[PDB]
RNA sequence: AAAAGUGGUGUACAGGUGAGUAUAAUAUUUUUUCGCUUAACUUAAAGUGAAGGCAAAUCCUUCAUAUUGCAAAAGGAUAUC
């Protein structure tokens, strides 16, 4: 089963992720089939922006990710939430309004 | 090269015949079983129908 | 005339005659298919 | 040598295939007879 | 309602070690041409009937039906009136 998931890298208290295409039953950090992108969870801040707004840097090869979702790849919950923001899949969870 | 094509083509003709004949002689046996089983069933089914006039 | 007479006249002779004939119709169907299959093989042999 | 043996063999199958189709027909119409 | 089980899937992944092992091999790269795939993933179609054994079953055994003729299946659950 191919999966679009994250490979935890970095150092202690400095997480960094690789968006990868790997078989489900393999080691988390083993060499995958492809590296589709990267994901940094800690939000950053523009250098000369004093407004206080934060952002998150995410590099993603949308063209390569769409092909794997088209052939039957199963993204994890975290990668699903990311792919839903860019506008590829529908969200799995939503804030209840009532 | 023509000898290989001619020799190979003839090999296929020998197979289609051996396959058709094998399948033919098989349907005959399967057809005879339908006969022995039909004459018995027909003889047994027409008897009942003959007692309901 | 009455319910008992009309109900007694009716019997399984019709139902029996129907079931038996129906089984023979499907039997002839199996023979028709087998007879047909033999024709599809007869025309192929003399063809080749 | 071998052709004469295979040609006649085909006639046998063509003959048997004709007989079987005749029996299955002799029974088909027979079923129709009692079906009337 | 609990406690043991029966069955399904998973324990073929992850994790650990370097004892043994002395090699050219049906090894491997490029181009051309291909084949196989009965579990899981993705899309779709069709079919999901009948008995017996164990306390019972989606367990085991077996049958009908499934282009021709060989060849399959298993049931469980929730609403509406
Ligand atoms: K292992
Ligand atoms: K060693
Ligand atoms: Mg009677
Ligand atoms: Mg080592
Ligand atoms: Mg059923």
Question: Residue A88's Cα: distance from chain center in Å?
Answer: 13
Give every CB contact of residue A29 below 8 A, 6+ residues apart in sequence. Answer: A7, A8, A9
CB pairs under 8 A between B and C: 42
Q: How many angstroms separate the CA of residue D1 from the nearest CA in chain C?
A: 20
Q: Do C41 and B27 touch (CB under 8 A)?
A: yes
- Cα–Cα distance between B6 and B25 in angstroms, integer? 29
Assess contact for A38 and A59: CB atoms under 8 A: yes
Output the CA angle A43-A46-A51, nearest 5 degrees.
Answer: 95
Experimental method: cryo-EM
Cα separation of B49 and C9, whole Å? 18
Q: List the 3-32 stretch of C: residues with Cβ below 8 A of B.
A: 13-14, 16-17, 20-21, 23-24, 27, 30-31
* Token representation of residue B31: 């057809």
Cβ A9 vs Cβ A31: under 8 Å: no
Q: What does each C-alpha distance from A71 to A23, A31, A64, A79 come to in angstroms?
A: 14, 21, 11, 17
Task: Give the number of other Cβ atoms within 10 Å of residue A80's Cβ.
Answer: 18
**Which resolution in angstroms does this entry have?**
2.8
What is the Cα–Cα distance from A22 to A42, expressed in whole angstroms? 24
Q: Which residues pair with A34 in a beta bridge?
A: A21
> Is the CB of residue A81 less than 8 Å from the CB of residue A5?
no
**Yes or no, beta carbons of D17 and C46 under 8 Å apart:** no
Residue of chain D nearest B42, judged by CA positions: D31
Q: Does residue C22 approach strand E to less than 7 Å at its CB? A: no
A88 contacts A67 by C-beta, under 8 angstroms: no
Starting at the edge strand that comes first in sequence, how are the strands of the sheet with A58-60 ordered? A2-11, A14-23, A34-39, A58-60
CB proximity A30–strand E (7 Å threshold): yes
- CA distance linking residue A80 with residue A96, whole number of Å: 19
Q: CA A71, C1' E32: Å apart?
A: 28
Nearest residue on chain C to B44, alpha-carbon basis: C20
DSSP string, chain B: -HHHHHHHHHHHHHHHHHHHHHHHHHHHHHHHHHHHHHHHHHHHHHHHHHT--
Residue nearest the C1' of E10 (CA based): A25
Nucleotide nearest to A28 (CA to C1'): E14
CB contact at 8 A, B30 and C41: no
Answer whether any strand E atom is within 7 A of the Cβ of A73. yes
Other chains touching C, judged by 3 or more CB pairs under 8 Å: B, D
- With CB atoms and an 8 Å threshold, state whether C24 touches D35: yes
Q: Any idea how long chain C is? A: 48
Full 3-state SS string of A14-76: EEEEEEEEEECCCCCCCCCCEEEEEECCCCECCCCCCCCCCECCEEECHHHHHHHHHHCCCCC
């Amino acid at each position: 089963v191919l999966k679009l998931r994250l490979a935890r890298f970095g150092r202690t208290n400095a997480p960094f992720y690789n968006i990868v295409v790997a078989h489900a039953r393999t080691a988390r950090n083993s060499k995958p089939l492809e590296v589709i992108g990267t994901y940094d969870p800690v939000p950053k801040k523009d250098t000369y922006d004093t407004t206080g707004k934060l952002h998150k840097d995410i590099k993603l090869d949308v063209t390569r990710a769409k092909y794997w979702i088209g052939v039957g790849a199963q993204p994890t919950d975290t990668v699903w939430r990311l792919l839903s923001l860019v506008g590829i899949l529908d969200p799995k969870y939503k804030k209840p309004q009532p | 090269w023509d000898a290989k094509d001619a020799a190979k083509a003839a090999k296929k003709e020998r197979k289609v015949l051996r396959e058709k004949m094998q399948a033919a002689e098989e349907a005959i046996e399967l057809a005879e079983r339908m006969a022995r089983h039909a004459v018995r069933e027909i003889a047994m089914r027409e008897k009942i129908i003959s007692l309901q006039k | 005339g009455d319910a008992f007479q009309r109900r007694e006249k009716a019997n399984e002779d019709f139902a029996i005659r129907q079931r038996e004939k129906e089984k023979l119709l499907e039997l002839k169907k199996k023979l028709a298919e087998q007879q047909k299959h033999l024709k599809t093989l007869s025309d192929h042999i003399d063809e080749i």
